[PDB]
Amino acid sequence: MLRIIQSPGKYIQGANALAAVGQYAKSLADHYLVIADDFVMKLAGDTLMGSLQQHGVKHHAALFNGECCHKEIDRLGRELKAHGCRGVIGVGGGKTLDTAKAIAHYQQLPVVLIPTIASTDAPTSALSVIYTEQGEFAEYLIYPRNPDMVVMDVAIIAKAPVRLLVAGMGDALSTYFEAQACFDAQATSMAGGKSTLAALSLARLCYDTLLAEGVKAKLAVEAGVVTEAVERIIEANTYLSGIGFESSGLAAAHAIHNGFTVLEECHHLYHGEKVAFGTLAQLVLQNSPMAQIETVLAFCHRIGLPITLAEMGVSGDAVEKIMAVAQASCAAGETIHNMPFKVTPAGVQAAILTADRLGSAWLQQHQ
Amino acid sequence: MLRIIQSPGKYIQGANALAAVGQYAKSLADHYLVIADDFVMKLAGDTLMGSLQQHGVKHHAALFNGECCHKEIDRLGRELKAHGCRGVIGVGGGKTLDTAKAIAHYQQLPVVLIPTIASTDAPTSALSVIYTEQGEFAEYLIYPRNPDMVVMDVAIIAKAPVRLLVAGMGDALSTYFEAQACFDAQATSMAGGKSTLAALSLARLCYDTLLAEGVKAKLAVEAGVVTEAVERIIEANTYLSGIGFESSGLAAAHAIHNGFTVLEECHHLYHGEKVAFGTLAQLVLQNSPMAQIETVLAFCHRIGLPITLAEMGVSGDAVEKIMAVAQASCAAGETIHNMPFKVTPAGVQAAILTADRLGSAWLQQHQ
Amino acid sequence: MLRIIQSPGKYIQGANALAAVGQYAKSLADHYLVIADDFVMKLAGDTLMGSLQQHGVKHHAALFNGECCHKEIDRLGRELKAHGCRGVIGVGGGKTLDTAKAIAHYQQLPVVLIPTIASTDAPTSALSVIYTEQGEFAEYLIYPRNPDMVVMDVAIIAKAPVRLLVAGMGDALSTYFEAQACFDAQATSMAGGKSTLAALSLARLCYDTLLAEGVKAKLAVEAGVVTEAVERIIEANTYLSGIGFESSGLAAAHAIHNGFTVLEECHHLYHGEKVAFGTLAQLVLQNSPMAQIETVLAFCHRIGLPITLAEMGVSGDAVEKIMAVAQASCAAGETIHNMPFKVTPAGVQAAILTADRLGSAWLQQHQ
Amino acid sequence: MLRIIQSPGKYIQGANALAAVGQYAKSLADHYLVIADDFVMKLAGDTLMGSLQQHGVKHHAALFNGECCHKEIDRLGRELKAHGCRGVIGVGGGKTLDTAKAIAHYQQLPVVLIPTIASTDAPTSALSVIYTEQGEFAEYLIYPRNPDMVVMDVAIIAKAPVRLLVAGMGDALSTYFEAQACFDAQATSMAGGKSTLAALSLARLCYDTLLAEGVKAKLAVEAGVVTEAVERIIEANTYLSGIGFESSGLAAAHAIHNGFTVLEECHHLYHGEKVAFGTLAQLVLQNSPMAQIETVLAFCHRIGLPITLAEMGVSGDAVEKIMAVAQASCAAGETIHNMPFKVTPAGVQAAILTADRLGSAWLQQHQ
Ligand code: NA
Ligand code: NA
Ligand code: NA
Ligand code: NA
Ligand SMILES: [Zn+2]
Ligand SMILES: [Zn+2]
Numbered sequence A, B, C, D: 001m002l003r004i005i006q007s008p009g010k011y012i013q014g015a016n017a018l019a020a021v022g023q024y025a026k027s028l029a030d031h032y033l034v035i036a037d038d039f040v041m042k043l044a045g046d047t048l049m050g051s052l053q054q055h056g057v058k059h060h061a062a063l064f065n066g067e068c069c070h071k072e073i074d075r076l077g078r079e080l081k082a083h084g085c086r087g088v089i090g091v092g093g094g095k096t097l098d099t100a101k102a103i104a105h106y107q108q109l110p111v112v113l114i115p116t117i118a119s120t121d122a123p124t125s126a127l128s129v130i131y132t133e134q135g136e137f138a139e140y141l142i143y144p145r146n147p148d149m150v151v152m153d154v155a156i157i158a159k160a161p162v163r164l165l166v167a168g169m170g171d172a173l174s175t176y177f178e179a180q181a182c183f184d185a186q187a188t189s190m191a192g193g194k195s196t197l198a199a200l201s202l203a204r205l206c207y208d209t210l211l212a213e214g215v216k217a218k219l220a221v222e223a224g225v226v227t228e229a230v231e232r233i234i235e236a237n238t239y240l241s242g243i244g245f246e247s248s249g250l251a252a253a254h255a256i257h258n259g260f261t262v263l264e265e266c267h268h269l270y271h272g273e274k275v276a277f278g279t280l281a282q283l284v285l286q287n288s289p290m291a292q293i294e295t296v297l298a299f300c301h302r303i304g305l306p307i308t309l310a311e312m313g314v315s316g317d318a319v320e321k322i323m324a325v326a327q328a329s330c331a332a333g334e335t336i337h338n339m340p341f342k343v344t345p346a347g348v349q350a351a352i353l354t355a356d357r358l359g360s361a362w363l364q365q366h367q
């Protein structure tokens, strides 16, 4: 009944954006804790601190210990309080960013996120995904506000391994299908209402950008460079997908992703790789026409995303393992109930096992 | 001049429908003879009797001796009379179902049919096909009413061998072409009049569902599971095709099927396999454009239906054998005279021999 | 411990041999019952009776009623006794030939067999295979002597459908592998002893002739003509294979063939088609090297013999059905115990299921 | 200067061996601690305890907590002492087996290992591989004696996912090349001397069995069954490879495997998958001829082992990451110095980067 859209205050993207972070950060605060692991500090630290200094922004670097846990969060909280910082900057990968969101939340301060990879649509969202230590989906943890600012330095991203860009396209790939399923069901998004037209359209624009630009961008990043295609994909993997999923909705593909986290065989594939397959399984679950399945199979195969259980490490008589995936995907509270029809574990198992068969037949025709 | 459509009273389909048969059967009678062979009783007996018991429906199981013959029919009639049953349930394959229709006819009682395979469109019809003992088409035997109720448990069907689903798609495949040929000829259907718009449209919907869903359903059933595609094909093979053929019309493809029953080389292929080829031959007989022939050849090849005489077991100098097929297909009273043009044995022989050549050339291009 | 080889007295082959049958038949008797069904009498009757008349051989035609049953046998016995015939001629297919062997056995008279097809290696042997009426292997029935004379008219055979020649090559294909397995096991043949060197060498010569001549012969028979390649294959399918199997030995392939007779899905494929697949399964059972499996797969695929369960009509979850095949193939008294190692139902099931997989992978590479 | 070969006392293999474990275990002790995790107890527990009971062998089950750590080892030690057990049985995967070896070592008792998968050649060896918690190779830990007995139930193994059999073939694949390199260098094995002729020949027999039987076995295990090919591969992955590597020698491939453990991108691939690629890199390092590289590439591609960095999860500008792999592979004490020539990090980096290119070119020709 209410339609709600939420968003980070400002999203900034472009080549060498890191060198301009000080103008934008200054507008929120004149003193920041900078959370980054050591690899990221060596990569990005001199440019960032340089930018901050140049705009009269004070900064204390803090070494992040790799994991997003209450201990590290409480620790970084105390450190912040002791130097008197009035803002948090997170720089690097997902665990660094999720940690910076939490620090800023508990200290009630503004946060600037600087992803150094574009492999998931997490950065813009008022969200963190908690797993167990064994790698098994635990909970969506939801903040009451979005990050203030998200800064995407495309030059940095295009030097990161192409596999991480592909995984982000895999995560982005589900956005349209989950958003349109929710929209059809009149389901409530994580923003707390029905989807706006805006959030659905951004989600569709995500899918359409991936199809137009995904191969061109992959080729550029394999060469280590930024073209306009790369700029478009980075927007698609980050802003379009991030607003689409948070303000428009999650459904079967992410629930199926969560369900796959109960199998050890997958546990090291990247989130977006698994979500791509979960999207395929969603297509079978909702009975998408063959032309649309073909389009998705050709896209995933062309950029290197998995289209069979074997490419996810799963072989043999996986009947029981996929029934376990299916039960977990259908747990109370999971997003798969946002589909515009009733879903059961047996239906999910069917969709998975069948998607595997579709992708295996597609591989045999090679194209 | 009159348009007539007839139908079973109720058609019910879905996963685990067998477990709900008691509510629906109760509405017609509170006491049933259950006709099933031993394999089917072992497969389905506990679920069915369980359902019946749970709704206060009384039941006597009777072991079916495999064949639909007057002896078995008269026998099962006497047995029914002796326990006082007020309804018949047929469960299993075609011969079991055809037997239950006859028992219910002679005893004038309501009948519930529970097909455990979806390999022909017989179940809904007021009809049985009589062969000789040598396997040669004898007659259409026509009842004055349709079965009261037809129950399709999709979970059971999806565990049956994929070859039986394919054969049902083969039988369903002819439905549109025969119905539209009859419609064009203003021919009289087995329902006794000209076709309604309804029966023709269901027949077209049959063809269109096969093209959209046939491969997807085949893949799911190869995995042993039910998806929405499987639900659609089962409806297509059963209800759409059954109403289409009975109330819209048969024409060349089924007459050609009947004609093939004079050759020993074919006699063990499934009905729908032969009907698929008979459909191809119908396309040549009525001079369908090449694009439509291509579509059908690609469909049959993609799901595993025969497109040449050699795939039907026929080789060598089959000139004389196909002339025998052609004479038999053109016998007085056969459905091939429902074509909107004059058909002769020589024309039928021509269409068969030519269809074989089309399918052999298609195989050489592989696609 | 004893080595024994047995043989028909004389085997005669060549184009238009039917027209010379009188010289050879005269040497055994001057008066024959001629057993042939009506189709065969119309095809071959005038040439045969012509030949017999021309050499002063008396003859009474008797119409064979299609089946090899004690009734028909006892009947034809009485008829023979009443005209005073001193010899039997069988002309046509396997059931006609098996009937003539029995008539000659019970009446203790000489028999001339004239096969009009070369689709099995039965004709030369002191044997008949009894099935049930449901098509299920019953028993080997063994006579105490071989037919006196076997006459192969190659012109007649080359006008018969190519599929029957292929099926005979399929039956012949097993001969070497079964003979060499028996030889290795020191197993006793149906001739009652260990194999001679002669019977084993004929069996090997069978395999080697099929590989050299099989495609060339198939091409000629597709054109309806006799070349030297066709003459060689007919000898291979008839004399080489017949002596090889009777005097050298049967083993897994024929036991597996027998086991497949418990499935309805196969029951109409020709004997040699099934035996070809049973040969493949034997290769897996005895762990033949991949190069030898490849050779056989390429031969069967090149001439049109089945290399998968699906080409034998078997699909879906055939785990239980193949366990039934395997149990039946291992029954007490079956030939599979002639293998040079211990065989169990589980091993046979394994070999079958694995052979199917080999042949399916071969089909995917097309070659 | 001394040649030394060591071995488990007895290696036993075959279908349903688990049901015969009691006769063999009884010969070493009449009372065992049985170490198995819960999944394995549910799978194998009733058969094993059944066998033990039937031969008068006493047994206390102990639940293994998944990890091979001193804590779990010391714990299981105390438990053993308290019930008075005179032997240890390990049943399941590598961590369970490595734990049972340690328990038996510290308690100085006999040990029976029952692997339920054939994915590495660890079981027969007097060895455990210690990693860090971050998954990074730590040390070879060496016991002074081999396990007393190793029991391979082939029926159990053939029901395990095919991917685990493939990974064991990947581990086995390196055995010949590392053994022959050591032999050539006159390097000292983990058994403490120069290689015997016996250990080298078993290693070669390993390679030759993989090439003859690997595809056939893979096909059988995909069907869930045991053929002779599967029996041969299980021997190859377990006994042949285990003696080959321990008593003949490790060299570049396993050192390169260890070096890859410093990258997160690989950390979840199975040991044998990584070792297969490390074998390829060894081929380039020692300049194997192209025909031998082709043979290995075709084998790995045909069974599903990785032949490029991308199939190991590594993409982009991996120059620095592969230099890190190369440094770690060349650490003091690593097995790569067993090569018959001087190896440097730069040479290893070269071999890796070049192997990737070979495998990528091979993929482009598809074959
Ligand atoms: Na998404
Ligand atoms: Na129809
Ligand atoms: Na034979
Ligand atoms: Na090894
Ligand atoms: Zn500060
Ligand atoms: Zn995601």
Ligand SMILES: [Zn+2]
Pocket (backbone or CB within 6 Å): B031, B032, B033, B059, B060, B080, B083, B084, B085, B086
């Ligand atoms: Zn009753």
Ligand SMILES: [Zn+2]
Pocket (backbone or CB within 6 Å): B120, B121, B171, B254, B271, B275
């Ligand atoms: Zn039909």
Ligand SMILES: [Zn+2]
Pocket (backbone or CB within 6 Å): C031, C032, C033, C059, C060, C080, C083, C084, C085, C086
């Ligand atoms: Zn006579």
Ligand SMILES: [Zn+2]
Pocket (backbone or CB within 6 Å): C120, C121, C171, C254, C271, C275
């Ligand atoms: Zn035979």
Ligand SMILES: [Zn+2]
Pocket (backbone or CB within 6 Å): D031, D032, D033, D059, D060, D080, D083, D084, D085, D086
């Ligand atoms: Zn104890």
Ligand SMILES: [Zn+2]
Pocket (backbone or CB within 6 Å): D120, D121, D171, D254, D271, D275
């Ligand atoms: Zn290893």
